[PDB]
Design a binder for this molecule. Structure first.
Ligand SMILES: Nc1ncnc2c1ncn2[C@@H]1O[C@H](COP(=O)(O)OP(=O)(O)O)[C@@H](O)[C@H]1O
Ligand SMILES: Nc1ncnc2c1ncn2[C@@H]1O[C@H](COP(=O)(O)OP(=O)(O)O)[C@@H](O)[C@H]1O
Ligand SMILES: Nc1ncnc2c1ncn2[C@@H]1O[C@H](COP(=O)(O)OP(=O)(O)O)[C@@H](O)[C@H]1O
Ligand SMILES: [Mg+2]
Ligand SMILES: [Mg+2]
Ligand SMILES: [Mg+2]
Ligand SMILES: [Mg+2]
Lengths: 529, 529, 523, 106
């Protein structure tokens, strides 16, 4: 009697390396513990005082960032419940672009409090009911917590003041410069129509000087050289071809069938004369710049140099499409000279050297266009990638503001007001749902707590001050990170604001993730292939 | 799980797993032992790792010899071992009733009934069943005929029918011989000697003693008619001094004197024996047999042979008492003042050689309060089987004598107790009526298995028996030759009241504890290394 | 490799270490959480020796399981400590310590310092002690019915609950007989002088405490009596054999008669010893060492019954029971050293073994509890439960103060602590109130193991305990309802509950103070 | 339960066959022949979707499924479920699942 045998039934029929968990202890509590560990892995990056992390993935690539979604992607999360919370965070990143760390923090908090309630004696069904009712109440409340609105997205100072908050959590030290840059770019590419495309903001990372030498460029930049002898052009007449810059050939096997010494002697001269005619027709349409998506032939390059045309070769087809969008041109699949409408224009096209890198610049002079580029300078590729992530955050914030112009106060003010109002609602709700409603409310406190903890002050004092001020009536008050001691100030008057849509989606997705994790009761993992 | 987070190499069976494991092992044991039950049962052969053969129908022997490593099986083996050590019979029925209790309880626990409630019903039914047993027990003057019927009911189950008809008279006469009015029966006073030369039906009762050794001097007689028996515990071989002594001499003559002197101490005891012999046997008419619990060196053996004494050495500490009760002398630890009253009488003493072994028979005592059973048989395994059977029969007769009551057999008491439990069930408060019903259906496993082993339909036979017992009220059981109901008290099929009571008690207790087991756990070192 | 510490020395530190310790502790707690209360279920443990342990006892379980985390080691050690000190509460203490560490984890995640938490815990412990001593009640230990109810309230949670009256009477008789006073020093040693002998077979209902002792022994010689109706008993530590001397006593023989003379001198020495014994006219002689066959001869000639090789502990119990005094030189034997007080020596066959009874004693200060049952495992569990019962009886006879059970005491103390916390204005009020609410785990666990609604019942109970004279209100572990302990009868010893609370709080303090684990280094 | 008591499995299966016959008869007797209106179909689809998914999502999917079937169904003509495409998009909440009275190509 020294061995416990597998029980008859599923335990014996189970495969070799498979695992089966059932019940609150083996499944629910272990899932909640995993999600809590995840929230702990990403907690220290939340907020402006959030610290960066250097994650190295399986490919030995280094990421230095405090962007939650990036950290999650580059981690190899293997617990399925944590995987689900990460799926929620990535859905938040896709829908809004900012708030992934909020999603993580809030989901982990909801799950911790759900474990607490299950221990005190509530059932998963009641916990889920209460969580859903409280999420509905929070969504009903948030519109009333909306404090300010954008009121103009064509300005450059207001848009900068609006993007500063989203691009402050990342790159806290230098955020006014970056908000200026991103506002310039966004309002350059913002059309008279209310539709805004984030892919029209291009980012070129060049390794030199520093983040303060970065600039915006109304046009496009390509780390390329010119194929020919011409390097600059001041009144570009760009002609864009998706076909190579060569003589068209047959899609069926072509053979030069010679039968006479005359044909043999004349074939090559006829070929080059044809190429010369083609390129001369192109030049005679007025085009001084040709951009080909395919390869370039030596004879065609010869004649482009002869007729003083700057040749550029863009290997990528997305790059070709974006150049066409930028300059107002049309990619021609044939080497036929373009008509007056198929041609594109740029106030200048030149070859420059930014740092060690050679670049071809299609630069408009007007403060507008269909595409704008942000040339990022920096002393490290990792630093420039982090600044690019911050730029993406700012651009996604601009798009969220084009979608919904409403704004809520940041620095934990909206979270504290939500917690207070949902607590007051749960105190009125009778039945066993009040416990879960009140815990859903208390979960919001995790946001200002995380902000305070990273600021370096006592989160308990911070939260007590916030509760006191929001009880006396100031809903726009949040914590002051510019204070060695626990302090608070008016987030609205300070200009620290979040997006109503961002908060809406973050709360919704975090609640859905927590509720799903709770709805899981049995886990049947297979043998890891 | 919890234990596996602290001891990773830990095996655990929880709540339902634990119950499935235990009930499965119990039913496995029951499935093996079902065939042992009754005289129509089948003999199992058991082969050791060395190749030794055992033929057995005994539940305890079968348990201990089976090759099992299960915790529940160990528990039930221990319960059976206690049953066997205290009563000698009832191990197979014990295992069967445990298995059937567990099965009938699983029948209701699979439907969500709690095992605690089932055990409450078990305890109530146990109480009522013990009452009904005390009611049906037959208090009878234990005459040779009753004891013969009892011993038959045991030996016919344990061995072949002719050998059972022999062992019956042997065992009953042995017990009726070593038994003193109102004096607990010392079964130690029944020696059990096995001889391996003749048929198994030659097993007899020697109204005396049989020692597994004989005289070690060749000139000693091999047959003595009218013998004085001297039971002694005195060394008659060379004894060295406690304190280290050593001999010191200056001449071969002195060495010779010391050699003759060093034996004077034992020569004196030999002389005392010889003087007693001469004083009690003035001629060669009678005989004189010395039986020493200690050694006798060749010099003493020669000295006694010269005077015509038969000396046996290294007898058994139990043979001291057995000889003082059979012959009728006094066992001595010293020859200080030995007198003819210290001697016993045996109307015949002789020797029997069997291959390399010798035996000494001491028979024709006057009224021996100690006897021996000579187990004759052609094989070691036959002898072992008969030893087990006579153990069972001796325990059965002793118990029938001690408890002047005796209980009917053939499942009659089980049927009647089932009916009484089912009529008592409504008086039980709550869903413990289901535990009572389970107890009744478990008690009904004895007649069921008896029919199954005689080759009858369990349900049809049991229905016949229950109908006959309900219409008439007579205690009826299975007739193993016709499958019809029969009155066990009239046909002479008797069981031990003590055995049935022990069954009820111990089976209820172990089944209750197993049902109340909710976690099997191996989380120790797993070895003493 | 130029290291500073040896390889295998791994050092963890910080909140990971704290959370790991707390999780290990609460895991140890979760292991035995369900073994609390009257409706608990048995667990089948597998020993490393192929044995089995079927029990409900927290200390038994934690003693049979093996761990490697030092926090779990510490929890197992405090369970052992509780068991050795009071002999009950071995899982209540574990559960309380787990809950205290669990609630301290909260404050630790929120930047509070472990020393602050610990000082708060110590304040709360002092106030718990005060509140328990205030709500306690006295006991008239002369009330056998009151003592029997206390013992029922202590064994009801164990397997022997089916034979509650029997086990209570056994434990009470055993402890009242082992109660002994000498030179003004009262001593209840129920470990040396209350013996449990488990004889498998029979039925538990015939188990009894003997007015005497029992050993597994037979007469040395079958001519000796096995039944004596007023035996005068002599106890010896010395062998009645002829053994060698301590020195190099080597002899040298040159004469013929000297060898025989030496052997006869040995025999005469044995005779003289046996005469020194017979001079006291005893009926029974019991030795811890051997008895030579010649000595047996002389004793039998004197009509004396001898028992050869008894254990030193059994001999001490025979001394205490029959009123004898162990001797080591029969020449130094006195009438005061002879044992009068035994009313019957019997040697009867239980199964196929011979057991010696020295029962029917008058004023026996030692006893043997003869347990009979279905199997060695059932009897081991019955013995453990009886150890619990006797330890509770002893704790009562020492400290006659009682407190109410069913979690009534836990709720009363939690309420008192919450009321006292309102005067606290510093930052420790929060951990203080937290341990207060962490005491609720006992009634919570009771409700969970009975199968009732924890939320509803604990709310109703916390509400009941906010009224004035309701500190005796608790819960049934058998129905899942609130009751008054004055009406139910579940009353625990104040000493038991004090030791429980103290051990729990100190274990929490220790594991909170712990940080920065280090390992690998070899002694 | 009965085979452990020595009953033959052949006899148990004969009883199974008899009981199957009688049960099919009783089923044909108790079936409720009803004009399949939108309300009945809604109750049916609810009875299935509430078991398979969350309650609010079931209240959505019920109307979705019933309308889809009532749309691709021609009087007295077996329903070709192939004519109900099922396209999944991974961007919004689960209660946005709708019925497009048309087609959605991927
Ligand atoms: N200057 C500031 N002072 C106080 N709080 C701020 C400030 N800037 C941003 N925050 C807060 O930091 C949070 C953003 O942190 P971040 O790491 O961007 O989370 P996420 O990426 O998930 O949105 C917002 O909730 C906002 O309230
Ligand atoms: N000749 C017989 N006819 C009918 N029943 C019998 C007969 N002999 C024994 N039995 C029954 O068979 C049962 C099992 O007998 P046995 O095998 O000796 O005991 P166990 O099963 O405990 O070893 C007994 O309870 C007894 O009543
Ligand atoms: N019948 C009962 N109803 C409710 N509570 C009980 C009952 N019997 C005992 N208790 C309570 O259960 C608690 C623990 O019981 P027990 O299991 O014996 O101790 P431990 O949990 O330390 O092993 C005790 O404090 C006692 O107050
Ligand atoms: Mg952000
Ligand atoms: Mg038998
Ligand atoms: Mg206890
Ligand atoms: Mg379905």
């Amino acid at each position: 009697a020294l061995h416990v045998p597998k029980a008859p039934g599923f335990a014996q029929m189970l495969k070799e390396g498979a695992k089966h968990f059932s019940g609150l202890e083996e499944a629910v509590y272990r899932n909640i513990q995993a999600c809590k560990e995840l929230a702990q892995t990403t907690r220290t990056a939340y907020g402006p005082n959030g610290m960066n992390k250097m994650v190295i993935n399986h490919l030995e690539k280094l990421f230095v960032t405090n962007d939650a979604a990036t950290i999650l992607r580059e981690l190899e999360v293997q617990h399925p419940a944590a995987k689900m919370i990460v799926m929620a965070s990535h859905m938040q990143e896709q829908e809004v672009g900012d708030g992934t760390n909020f999603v993580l923090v809030f989901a982990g908090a909801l799950l911790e409090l759900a474990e607490e309630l299950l221990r005190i004696g509530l059932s998963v069904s009641e916990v889920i009911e209460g969580y859903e009712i409280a999420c509905r109440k929070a969504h009903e409340i948030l519109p009333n917590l909306v404090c300010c609105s954008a009121k103009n997205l064509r300005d450059i100072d207001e848009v900068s003041s609006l993007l500063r908050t989203s691009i402050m959590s990342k790159q806290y030290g230098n955020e006014v410069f970056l908000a200026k840059l991103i506002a310039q770019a966004c309002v350059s590419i913002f059309p008279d129509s209310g539709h805004f495309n984030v892919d029209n903001i291009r980012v070129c990372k060049i390794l030199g000087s520093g983040i303060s030498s970065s600039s915006v460029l109304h046009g496009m930049v390509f780390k390329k050289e010119t194929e020919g002898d011409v390097t600059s052009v001041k009144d570009a007449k760009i002609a864009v071809y998706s076909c190579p810059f060569d003589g068209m050939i047959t899609e069926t096997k072509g053979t030069v069938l010679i039968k006479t010494a005359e044909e043999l002697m004349n074939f090559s001269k006829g070929e080059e004369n044809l190429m010369d005619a083609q390129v001369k027709a192109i030049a005679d349409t007025g085009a001084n710049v040709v951009v080909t998506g395919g390869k370039v032939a030596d004879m065609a390059l010869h004649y482009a140099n002869k007729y003083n045309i700057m040749l550029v070769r863009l290997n990528s087809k997305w790059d070709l499409r974006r150049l066409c969008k930028t300059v107002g041109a049309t990619a021609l699949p044939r080497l036929t000279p373009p008509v007056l409408e198929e041609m594109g224009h740029c106030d200048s096209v030149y070859l420059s050297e930014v740092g060690d890198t050679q670049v071809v610049v299609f630069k408009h002079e007007k403060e507008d266009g269909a595409i704008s580029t942000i040339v990022l300078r920096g002393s490290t590729d990792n630093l420039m990638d982090d600044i690019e992530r911050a730029v993406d955050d700012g651009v996604n914030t601009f798009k969220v503001l084009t979608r919904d112009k409403r704004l809520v106060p940041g620095g934990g003010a909206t979270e504290i007001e939500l917690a207070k109002q949902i607590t007051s609602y749960g105190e009125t709700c009778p039945g066993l749902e009040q416990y879960a409603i009140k815990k859903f409310a208390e979960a919001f406190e995790a946001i200002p707590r995380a902000l305070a903890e990273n600021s370096g002050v006592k989160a308990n004092e911070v939260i007590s001050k916030l509760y006191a001020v929001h009880q006396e009536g100031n809903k726009n008050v949040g914590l002051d990170i510019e204070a060695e001691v626990p302090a608070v100030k008016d987030m609205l008057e300070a200009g620290i604001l979040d997006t109503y849509l961002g908060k809406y989606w973050a709360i919704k997705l975090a609640t859905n993730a927590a509720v799903t994790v709770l709805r899981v009761d049995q886990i049947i993992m297979a043998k890891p292939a | 799980a919890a234990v596996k987070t602290l001891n990773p190499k830990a095996e655990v069976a929880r709540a339902q797993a634990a119950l499935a494991v235990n009930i499965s092992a119990a039913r496995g044991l029951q499935d093996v032992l079902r065939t042992n039950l009754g005289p129509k049962g089948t003999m199992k052969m058991l082969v050791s790792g060395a190749g030794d053969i055992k033929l057995t129908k005994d539940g305890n022997v079968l348990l201990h010899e089976m090759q099992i490593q299960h915790p529940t099986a160990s528990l039930i083996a221990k319960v059976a071992t206690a049953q066997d050590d205290i009563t000698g019979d009832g191990t197979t029925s014990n295992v069967l009733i445990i298995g059937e209790l567990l099965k009938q309880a699983d029948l209701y626990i699979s439907e969500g009934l709690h095992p605690r409630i089932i055990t409450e019903g078990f305890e109530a039914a146990k109480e009522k069943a013990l009452q009904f047993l005390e009611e049906v027990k037959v208090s009878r003057e234990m005459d040779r005929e009753t004891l013969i019927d009892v011993a038959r009911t045991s030996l016919r189950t344990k061995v072949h029918a002719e050998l059972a008809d022999v062992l019956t008279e042997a065992v009953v006469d042995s017990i009726l011989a070593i038994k003193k009015q109102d004096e607990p029966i010392d079964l130690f006073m029944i020696e059990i000697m096995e001889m391996k030369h003749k048929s198994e039906t030659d097993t007899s009762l020697i109204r005396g003693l049989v020692l597994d050794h004989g005289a070690r001097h060749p000139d000693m007689k091999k047959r003595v008619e009218d013998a004085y028996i001297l039971t002694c515990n005195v060394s008659l071989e060379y004894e060295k001094t406690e304190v280290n002594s050593g001999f010191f001499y200056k001449s071969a003559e002195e060495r010779e004197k010391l050699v003759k002197a060093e034996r004077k101490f034992i020569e004196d005891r030999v002389k005392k024996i010889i003087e007693l012999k001469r004083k009690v046997c003035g001629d060669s008419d009678k005989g004189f047999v010395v039986i020493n619990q200690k050694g006798i060196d060749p010099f003493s053996l020669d000295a006694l042979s010269k005077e015509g004494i038969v000396a046996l050495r290294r007898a058994k500490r139990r043979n001291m008492e057995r000889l003082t009760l059979a012959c009728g002398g006094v066992a001595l630890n010293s020859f200080d003042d030995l007198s003819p009253d210290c001697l016993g009488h045996a109307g015949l003493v002789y020797e029997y050689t069997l291959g390399e072994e010798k035996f000494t028979f001491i028979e024709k005592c006057n009224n021996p309060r100690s006897v021996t059973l000579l187990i004759k048989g052609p094989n070691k395994h036959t002898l072992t089987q008969i030893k087990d059977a006579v153990r069972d029969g001796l325990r059965a007769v002793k118990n029938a004598i001690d408890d002047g009551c005796v209980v009917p057999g053939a499942g009659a008491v089980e049927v009647a107790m089932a009916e009484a439990l089912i009529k008592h069930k409504p008086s039980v408060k709550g869903r413990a009526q289901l535990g009572v019903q389970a107890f009744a259906d478990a008690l009904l496993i004895i007649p069921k298995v008896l029919a199954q082993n005689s080759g009858f339909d369990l349900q049809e036979t049991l229905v016949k028996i229950q109908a006959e017992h309900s219409e008439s009220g007579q205690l009826v059981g299975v007739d193993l030759n016709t499958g019809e109901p029969m009155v066990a008290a009239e046909v002479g099929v008797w069981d031990n009241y003590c055995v049935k009571k022990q069954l009820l008690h111990s089976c209820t207790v172990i089944a209750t504890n197993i049902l109340l087991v909710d976690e099997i756990m191996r989380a120790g070192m797993s070895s003493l290394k | 490799p130029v290291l500073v510490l040896s390889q295998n020395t791994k050092r963890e530190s910080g909140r990971k270490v704290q959370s790991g310790n707390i999780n290990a502790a609460k895991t140890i707690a979760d292991i035995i959480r369900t073994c609390l209360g009257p409706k608990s279920m048995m667990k089948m443990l597998l020993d490393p020796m192929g044995g089995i342990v079927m029990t409900n006892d927290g200390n038994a379980i934690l003693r049979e399981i093996q761990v490697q985390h030092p926090a779990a080691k510490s929890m197992i050690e405090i369970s052992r400590t509780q068991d050795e000190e009071v002999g009950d509460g071995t899982t209540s203490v574990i559960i309380l310590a787990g809950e205290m560490l669990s609630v301290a984890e909260h404050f630790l995640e929120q930047q509070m310092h472990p020393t602050v938490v610990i000082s708060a815990y110590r304040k709360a412990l002092d106030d718990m002690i005060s509140t328990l001593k205030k709500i306690s009640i006295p006991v008239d230990i002369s009330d056998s019915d009151m003592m029997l109810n206390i013992i029922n309230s202590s064994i009801t949670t164990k397997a022997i609950s089916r034979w509650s009256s029997l086990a209570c009477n056994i434990a009470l008789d055993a402890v009242k007989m082992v109660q002994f006073e000498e030179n003004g020093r009262k001593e209840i040693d129920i470990k040396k002088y209350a013996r449990v002998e488990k004889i498998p077979g029979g039925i538990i209902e015939d188990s009894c405490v003997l007015r005497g002792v029992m050993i597994n022994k037979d007469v040395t010689h079958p001519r000796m009596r096995r039944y004596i109706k007023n035996p005068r008993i002599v106890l010896l530590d010395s062998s009645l054999e002829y053994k060698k001397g301590e020195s190099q006593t080597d002899i040298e023989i040159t004469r013929e008669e000297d060898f025989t003379r030496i052997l006869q001198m040995e025999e005469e020495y044995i005779q003289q010893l046996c005469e020194d014994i017979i001079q006291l006219k005893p009926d029974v002689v019991i030795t811890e060492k051997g008895i030579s066959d010649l000595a047996q001869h002389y004793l039998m000639r004197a009509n004396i019954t001898a028992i050869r090789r008894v254990r030193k502990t059994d001999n001490n119990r025979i001394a205490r029971a029959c009123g004898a005094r162990i001797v080591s030189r029969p020449e130094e034997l006195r009438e005061d050293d002879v044992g009068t007080g035994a009313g019957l020596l019997e040697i009867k066959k239980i199964g196929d073994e011979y057991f010696t009874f020295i029962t029917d004693c008058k004023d026996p200060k030692a006893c043997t509890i003869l347990l009979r049952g279905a199997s060695k495992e059932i009897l081991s569990e019955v013995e453990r439960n009886l150890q619990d019962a006797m330890q509770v009886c002893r704790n009562v006879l020492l400290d006659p103060q009682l407190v109410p059970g069913g979690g009534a005491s836990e709720m009363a103390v939690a309420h008192a602590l919450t009321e006292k916390s309102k005067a606290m204005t510093g930052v420790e009020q929060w951990p203080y109130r937290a341990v207060a609410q962490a005491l609720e785990v006992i009634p919570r666990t009771l409700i969970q193991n009975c199968g009732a609604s924890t939320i509803r019942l604990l709310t109703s109970l916390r509400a009941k305990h906010t009224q004035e004279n309701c500190e005796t209100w608790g819960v049934n572990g058998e129905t899942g309802t609130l009751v008054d302990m004055k009406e139910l009868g579940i009353w625990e010893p104040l000493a038991v509950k004090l030791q429980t609370y103290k051990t729990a709080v100190e274990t929490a303090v220790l594991l909170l103070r712990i940080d920065d684990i280090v390992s690998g280094h070899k002694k």
